[PDB]
């Protein structure tokens, strides 16, 4: 930890409780992954026939 460590800590924390505790109506990009993006998926192998 000689350099590049920054604001750094050691604790038992559950961050998914932390952002859902109190209330919060919009994202906060320090705790949460920034955004979704445009892509699509196949219907599955057999499933379109059944």
């Amino acid at each position: 930890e000689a350099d590049g460590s920054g604001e750094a800590g050691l604790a038992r924390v559950d961050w998914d409780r932390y952002l859902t505790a109190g209330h919060r109506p919009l994202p906060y990009t320090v705790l949460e992954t920034r955004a979704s993006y445009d892509e699509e998926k196949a219907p599955g192998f057999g499933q379109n026939r059944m």
Binding site: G6, G9, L10, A11, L26, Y28
Partner: protein, 556 residues
Amino acid sequence: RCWLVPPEPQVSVVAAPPHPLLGTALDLVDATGQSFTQQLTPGQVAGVFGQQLYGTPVLPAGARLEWLLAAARHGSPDSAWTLTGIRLPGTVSAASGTPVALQTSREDSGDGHRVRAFVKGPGTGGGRWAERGGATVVPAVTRPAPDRVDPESLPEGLAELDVAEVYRRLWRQGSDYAEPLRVLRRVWLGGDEAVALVGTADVPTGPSGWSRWAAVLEAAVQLAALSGSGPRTPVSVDRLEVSGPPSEVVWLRVRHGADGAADAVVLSGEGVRLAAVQGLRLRPMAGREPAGLAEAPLERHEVVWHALAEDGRPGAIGGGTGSWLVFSDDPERAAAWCDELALFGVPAVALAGEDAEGRDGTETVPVGTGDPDVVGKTFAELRERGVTVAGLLVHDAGDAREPASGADDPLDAACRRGGRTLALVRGFLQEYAEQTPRIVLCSAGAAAGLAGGPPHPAQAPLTALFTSLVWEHPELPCAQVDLDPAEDPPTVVSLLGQVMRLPGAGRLAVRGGRWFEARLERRPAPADRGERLALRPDATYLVAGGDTRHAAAALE
């Protein structure tokens, strides 16, 4: 015939499954009391243990109460049951992915019909089997019950609640429930009693038969827990009485009429009596410890600055629907950014603190006079002119106050900025917050770990003021953009572009050309390094500034 297996008998019994908490009945030859055993594998445990406390799976209190009733009735045709003296010590839990062994026994006391039922939970290594409940059983209840009570008479004195807020109140008490135990459908509560509607309470083996009582009794615990505050869990019941399997709909009444205890009754869709409970106590286990129970390991948590190399292109400012206010330590910088925004048709207004001269036609604000009233009385005047605001830019000069004043003190350099910027941020929001404006706190040399030299300690009040907004005025978008303290600042359209791509809030930095974003991320923390460590013996140590409780452990 040529087959691996000989033919099965042409007639056989229906072979209905054993109740999942009590399992196979053992057949010891000489034994007086009957006993039963079950193993739950890592795939079964999370199915029966449908409640979580602080993330760890736990056996619901209604399921412990039904486990004792299922163990009580085992060999008997009787449809009416009385359980008394019920005690339920501790929390039954299993760390995710771990086996559980369960055991139970019936001892006939010889006191007429009186049977004692016990329930026991697992141990390994230095651990051994431990008690997790007990009750006394009598059959043949042999007393009448009331005539039909109208369910539509029950809610008339009481306020209705949203079932979404009922389960949110429970989440703020450490408790979450899987779908088979989310059985409430309407709730009414007020003063010292409550009533509710319970659906088909269909636990595993419970879409028909007696097992449905596990969820109907758990609904009584959810309701009894709803009236108090702080974490609490059932410890005792002094009577439970049940007649028959419970109907597809039932009505619950729960009352807090005693000295710190609850009583309850259950009625059918017809208004007929099904069950009653007396002396349901949660209070002797109010405030039991979460720190010995939570699933999370000890870890190292660090803020990492990641490059926005993917997709870091500024985009467009959302039109001139409201002005941008620019406030700066330097009137020339405030003017330069207002002139830059004007070229794009985004309307802008320049402001300065009144210890700076009005050199270039800015508005001037009494900032430094640390009262939100005089700064508010300034920002209010622009609303009386008819100014609408889309957002505010706040800009800070960095270390330049040191050579400009000719004296050094970093604690004074911090404390001078805090009060000035608090007066600005409050004095703005008190006049415009209904418009949902955007705030940008553009520090310089505040962000650690990145290039641009060591961060200036005097900038720390800006990061504190940013993070204080995010949890206190959550309707407002805001962002911190920490500039390099030595390079020329980027074009103001580059700031507002990469800022307006944030919904909600975030921390950003610029060093050379690149944009960076702060994320908080986690890695394992080997405490066994300290178990291997020895402090060097030929030395003094100082432990400083603590209270007694920390000092004793530090010295230990």
